[PDB]
Structure formats: C-alpha cells, structure tokens
Design a protein around this motif. Structure first.
Motif, PDB file in Angstrom:
ATOM      1  N   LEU A  27       0.842  -1.187   0.000  1.00 50.18           N
ATOM      2  CA  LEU A  27       0.000   0.000   0.000  1.00 50.18           C
ATOM      3  C   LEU A  27       0.880   1.241   0.000  1.00 50.18           C
ATOM      4  O   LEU A  27       1.775   1.370   0.837  1.00 50.18           O
ATOM      5  CB  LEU A  27      -0.924   0.019   1.213  1.00 50.18           C
ATOM      6  CG  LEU A  27      -1.693  -1.249   1.554  1.00 50.18           C
ATOM      7  CD1 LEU A  27      -2.681  -0.916   2.607  1.00 50.18           C
ATOM      8  CD2 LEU A  27      -2.418  -1.777   0.356  1.00 50.18           C
ATOM      9  N   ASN A  29      -0.419   4.661  -0.244  1.00 53.52           N
ATOM     10  CA  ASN A  29      -1.042   5.909   0.179  1.00 53.52           C
ATOM     11  C   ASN A  29      -1.882   5.764   1.443  1.00 53.52           C
ATOM     12  O   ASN A  29      -2.700   6.640   1.730  1.00 53.52           O
ATOM     13  CB  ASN A  29      -1.898   6.479  -0.952  1.00 53.52           C
ATOM     14  CG  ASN A  29      -1.125   6.639  -2.239  1.00 53.52           C
ATOM     15  OD1 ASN A  29       0.027   7.063  -2.233  1.00 53.52           O
ATOM     16  ND2 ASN A  29      -1.756   6.300  -3.355  1.00 53.52           N
ATOM     17  N   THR A  30      -1.691   4.695   2.213  1.00 49.23           N
ATOM     18  CA  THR A  30      -2.437   4.514   3.450  1.00 49.23           C
ATOM     19  C   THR A  30      -1.645   3.626   4.400  1.00 49.23           C
ATOM     20  O   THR A  30      -0.563   3.136   4.073  1.00 49.23           O
ATOM     21  CB  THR A  30      -3.825   3.919   3.192  1.00 49.23           C
ATOM     22  OG1 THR A  30      -4.462   3.628   4.441  1.00 49.23           O
ATOM     23  CG2 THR A  30      -3.718   2.660   2.380  1.00 49.23           C
TER      24      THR A  30
ATOM     25  N   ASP C  37      -7.019   2.887  -2.351  1.00 48.61           N
ATOM     26  CA  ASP C  37      -5.678   3.405  -2.102  1.00 48.61           C
ATOM     27  C   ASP C  37      -5.478   4.665  -2.937  1.00 48.61           C
ATOM     28  O   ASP C  37      -4.975   4.630  -4.061  1.00 48.61           O
ATOM     29  CB  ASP C  37      -4.641   2.337  -2.425  1.00 48.61           C
ATOM     30  CG  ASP C  37      -3.326   2.578  -1.743  1.00 48.61           C
ATOM     31  OD1 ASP C  37      -3.274   3.446  -0.851  1.00 48.61           O
ATOM     32  OD2 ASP C  37      -2.344   1.895  -2.092  1.00 48.61           O
TER      33      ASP C  37
END
Lengths: 47, 64, 46
Positions: A27, A29-30, C37
């Motif tokens: 992942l 962006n998180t 995402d």
C-alpha cells in the motif's frame, strides 16, 4: 454426416480444482493497522 | 513479527496447497534468526518464495 | 471455492497485505485494494 455433427457438437460443450496462491500487495497511500488517540481519559481506536 | 504473521495466515486452512494448507508448521528460531518450515517438498518451496518477497532492506528517516 | 476461506493478514513491517486464496480470489482483492488506495489532501483549520 448427422452422427458426426451431433457427436462433435455435444463434445465441445463439455470441453469449453484450484491451487492456492499467496499474494503480497504493498500500500502506497495509506496505513495498515489501527490508529489510537486519547481525549483526556478515554481511548479511541479507528479500524 | 514475521513468524506470527505467516502463522496466522496458515491457521485452520483446510485448503489444497501445492496435502493441505493446514498441516504446515512454522516455528521461529531466534538463535540464528531463521524460520523452520515443515511440510511437503512443494509447500516448503511455496513459503520460500513468499519470504524472499517480504525480506527487503529499509531506509532511514531522521525527524526534527 | 467459497468466499469464507480467504485469509487476510496485515504485515506492518513492510506495510502490505497478505492474501491467501485461489488464483481468482487473489486477483479479486487486488482490484479492490487499488480502489481504496488514493492520496489525500491537507486541511488547515483556524
């Protein structure tokens, strides 16, 4: 000719188990995992 | 750590991994920093390819 | 197989998910993850 067309038509219908597989998905962006903060006495947990 | 994440992934798991996926045993051996996997010759190669994807070098961050 | 035999385990040491299933269920979760995402924006409150 009829006995060839019928028998070669019902044998393309039957023609036309699963192994397990582990995938890793990064992942970008998180965050995985929960976030915790406090309001002066009590804890809040966000999934 | 890494030995608790793969142990919970293979927990229960009556699944045809190539016997079953539920009879693989994974035990951490910290004295030489290595995993101990017990299974068939196809399940041992299956976990060895997963471990080499989770084993990468990290970068340093300095926070001011 | 079924939807009930998929195992999902968080691996925080490299910030990634571990999905165990068939070759069609692994591709099914990989398309869901790329929709959840996205990059976020910053708000400053005064």
């Amino acid at each position: 000719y009829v006995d060839m067309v019928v028998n070669a038509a019902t044998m393309m219908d039957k023609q036309n188990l699963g192994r397990q597989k582990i995938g890793v998905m990064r992942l970008n962006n998180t965050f995985v995992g929960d976030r915790t903060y406090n309001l002066r006495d009590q804890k809040m947990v966000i999934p | 750590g890494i030995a608790t994440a793969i142990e919970r992934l293979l927990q229960g798991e009556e699944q045809p991994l190539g016997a079953a996926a539920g009879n693989i045993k994974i035990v951490a051996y910290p004295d030489t920093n290595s995993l101990l996997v017990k299974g068939t010759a196809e399940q041992v190669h299956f976990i060895e390819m997963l471990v080499k994807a989770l084993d990468v070098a990290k970068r340093h961050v300095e926070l001011s």
